[PDB]
């Protein structure tokens, strides 16, 4: 196929725009999340170091609301537009159906928008996939992961973007109840997971957790260097 009717079915049916945007997230920076017993960690690398940057602006991690954060991968500006639209919708729900929205509802809204960038020759498909995570109305941990197709599956813990697979089949090989009992080990799994893909050490991996019912707390470059604190956990106890 070529230009017109930008979303054309393939001769077998392989809607080219879909997997074409799918490929867009393999050059996207690798992100990951874990749904823990009472904490949820949201880790992502930034292997475009450009150390003459302001890290504040180039976070991957955005927060949707009092009860939701996310990370993504792919075309950053498109993701920013997604985030703003989702924030608007979340505010509208909290006004009209007033309650803290559940993670599933906002994920379903995201998926509906994402898949409704498939009609209307017009609009082109979005080139992002998201890791929506947050604590519900009840305080249970939740996790949801989508793709440009429009599907909005949920995972125990998943990774997207560059080399996402290797992280995934590291993850089930190590995801267990005696890995999430402690929050420190909970984040340590993510640490090791990106260690498998990071630019050789705790280099520019930005992450934050959301413990139950308080806030999104930015895991920061503390005096201990929170990052390299857990990093050295693995350095000197992985033997």
């Amino acid at each position: 196929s070529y230009d017109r009717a930008i979303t054309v079915f393939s001769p077998d049916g392989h809607l080219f725009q879909v997997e074409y945007a799918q490929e867009a997230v393999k050059k996207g920076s690798t992100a990951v999340g874990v749904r823990g017993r009472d904490i949820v960690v949201l880790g992502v690398e930034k292997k475009s170091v450009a150390k003459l940057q302001d890290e504040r602006t180039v976070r991957k991690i955005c927060a949707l609301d009092d009860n939701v954060c996310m990370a993504f991968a792919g075309l950053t500006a498109d993701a920013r537009i997604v985030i703003n639209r989702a924030r608007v919708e979340c505010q509208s729900h909290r006004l009209t159906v007033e309650d803290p929205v559940t993670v599933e509802y906002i994920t379903r809204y995201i998926a509906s928008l994402k898949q409704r960038y498939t009609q209307s020759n017009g609009r082109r498909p979005f080139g992002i996939s998201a890791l929506i995570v947050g604590f519900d109305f009840d305080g249970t941990p939740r996790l949801y992961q989508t793709d440009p197709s429009g599907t909005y599956h949920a995972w125990k813990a998943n990774a997207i973007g560059r080399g996402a697979k290797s992280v995934r089949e590291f993850l089930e090989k190590n995801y267990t109840d005696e890995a999430i009992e402690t929050d420190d080990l909970t984040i340590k799994l993510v640490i090791k997971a990106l260690l498998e893909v990071v630019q050789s050490g705790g280099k520019n991996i930005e992450l934050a957790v959301m413990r139950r019912d308080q806030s999104l707390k930015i895991l920061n470059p503390e005096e201990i260097e929170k990052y390299v604190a857990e990093i050295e956990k693995e350095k000197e106890e992985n033997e």
Binding site: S1, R4, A5
Partner: protein
């Protein structure tokens, strides 16, 4: 490829079918992997081996009657397979736009990938049964898998296929012809007499049976094509009986025995036929 927005550039394709833009190292690397992917495997079923040597060199042949088209294969199966005992030495492992979805299956009872059969009394008679649409390069692949480049002078071929009357071009309108009807084409060496009138000069055949006929004629092999132009490609009784004049030709005189039991077999088959959609197409 235009009308993404208002006032744009149409870019009609090309009339030699030239819209292929008239080959980087990763391009012929993936070409290697892709060519090794689309393998026409002459699979000796349940053994899948011992078939590197092509049929004309693997087993000397005398009669290779082949059916292409769902109705052609139905016709040959129902009017011959019931007559004699036909085991399958093997078939063709074919993936393409047709017969997709993990070709290795239950043998695809309501599909076909060129299942061959030979007789007990005279195993020299081969019957290939498939309407599968092999790729433009894949006709050559399959043909040199089965025949090779050594054309022997002892075997004779009958080909059956169907094309829509819409495709047929005559001075009168297509919707005014006594469809279905019959046409045929003979090789240069096919001195055998025909049973149906030859195809008119302008209208041609451009497909797998054209491949087989070109191979046979070019390499002096006597072969014959038989063609019925019907209006529906579904499993049709009427288009089955359209080929009935074949039941008189020289190559077929010793095979067909019983007509009405064949007809009841056909009624059984098309009562259990495909679940073809109720769109009216």
């Amino acid at each position: 490829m235009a009308a993404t927005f208002f006032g744009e550039v149409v870019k009609a394709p090309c009339r030699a079918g030239t819209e292929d833009e008239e080959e980087t190292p990763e391009d012929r690397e993936v070409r290697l992997q892709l060519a090794r992917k689309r393998e026409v495997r002459l699979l000796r079923r349940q053994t899948k081996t011992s078939l590197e040597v092509s049929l004309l060199e693997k087993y000397p042949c005398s009669k290779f009657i082949i059916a292409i088209g769902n109705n052609a294969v139905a016709f040959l199966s129902s009017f011959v397979m019931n007559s004699g005992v036909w085991e399958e030495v093997g078939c063709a492992k074919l993936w393409n736009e047709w017969c997709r979805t993990t070709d290795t299956t239950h043998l695809s009872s309501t599909e076909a990938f060129c299942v061959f059969y030979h007789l007990k009394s005279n195993p020299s008679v081969f019957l290939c049964q498939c309407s599968c649409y092999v790729a433009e390069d894949q006709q050559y692949q399959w043909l040199e898998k089965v025949f090779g480049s050594c054309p022997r002078k002892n075997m004779q071929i009958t080909i059956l296929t169907c094309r829509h009357v819409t495709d047929y071009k005559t001075s009168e309108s297509t919707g005014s012809l006594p469809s279905p009807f019959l046409r045929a084409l003979k090789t240069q060496n096919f001195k055998d007499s025909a049973c149906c009138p030859l195809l008119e000069q302008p209208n041609i055949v451009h497909d797998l049976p054209a491949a087989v006929l070109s191979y046979c004629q070019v390499w002096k092999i006597p072969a014959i094509l038989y063609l019925c132009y019907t209006d529906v490609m579904k499993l049709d009784l009427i288009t089955v009986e359209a080929f009935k004049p074949i039941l008189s030709t020289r190559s077929l005189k010793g095979l067909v025995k019983n007509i009405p039991q064949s007809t009841e077999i056909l009624k059984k088959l098309m009562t259990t036929n495909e679940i073809q959609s109720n769109i009216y197409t």
